Amino acid sequence: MIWTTGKTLCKTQKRPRNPYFAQAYDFMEKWLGGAREFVLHTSGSTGMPKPITVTRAQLAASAAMTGKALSLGPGTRALVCLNVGYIAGLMMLVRGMELDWELTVTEPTANPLAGLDHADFDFVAMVPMQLQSILENSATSGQVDRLGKVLLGGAPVNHALAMQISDLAMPVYQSYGMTETVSHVALKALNGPEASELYVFLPGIQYGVDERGCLHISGAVTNGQTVQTNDLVEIHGNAFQWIGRADNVINSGGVKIVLDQIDQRIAAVFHHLNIGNAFFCWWEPDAKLGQKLVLVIENAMPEALTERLTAEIRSRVSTYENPKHIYFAKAFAKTQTDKIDKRATFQKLS
DSSP states (O other), X not given: OEEEEOTTGGGTOOOOSSHHXXXXXXXXHHHHHTOSEEEEXXXXXXXXXXXXXXXXXXXXXXXXXXXXXXXOOTTOEEEEOSOTTSHHHHHHHHHHHHHTOEEEXXXXXXXXXXXXXXXXXXXXXXXXXXXXXXHHOTTTGGGGGGGOSEEEOSSOXXXXXXXXXXXXXXXXXXXXXXXXXXXXXXXXXXXXXXXXXXXXXXXXXXXXXXXXXEEEEESGGGTTOOEEEEEXXXXXXXXXXXXXXXXXXXXXXXXXXXXXXXXXXXXXXXXXXXXXXXXXXXXXXXXXXXXXXXXXXXXXXXXHHHHHHHHHHHHHSOGGGSOSOEEEESSOOBOTTSOBXXXXXXXXXX
């Protein structure tokens, strides 16, 4: 249930009979052969596999960053428990060959430690559910530290797993990246005294924001082309904090307000007053505040109910997060999918 390999070990090694492991061997043989580019696989928008081509230079640059940032030099004992049929797993092989690691390749499962005792590694990359599985399974929980140091991919860790990681005497990090950057371009520390919400940029990454305040990055991993995200961020020296999505966050008098969050708070007020009118929070330019939060409601309401509404809202939120005006529209504009066109609705109010 494991195939052991390496740069030099790959030179004499026979091709596995297990098809899964032969994927790895084939890729490695091709890497060593000198290929200038590679067709690997990722999941598309429908959750089905799709080919993507990446250059040798891209992969090599990405591997080098990881090695430097996490101090994983020659002799590193790495466990490969990500699907090598896909880019996440293949990157472990590239790092292994570029950085002279000993690679222990296992079949990707929910619990990478479950099948092998005498586990003893210096590095493993995995998804958060894999670490949670190891921690929950009392046959493997006691050996979680045998992972050495853990790099997590996938979605930011949930609260319960974050609390568990905080108590591990072992370095755990989480990646920020995308397929367009091959792999990660920044790393968050999830425990130890430097634990925080900041993603610290890997070396060789150039970074900045566009006019919306959204992160863009470029480097050898992007073939020097800048990649523009739609992630609203705040940069702090060589690191960033993720804030949200550009069109969903406003800045009113230096206070950041998330529109859908304020909407949920107002919704509880509507429900409580039995107001069936549709509504949405929005904003408008304001010289004093920058952006002024407002409230838009469909169909007029009686002055009495409007007064109740106004007062109840003001009692539930700070004056700084209270809509500064309530606009009433006869009918909300709708898209072709029957969704409120909020932007069009607002312009019409003029």
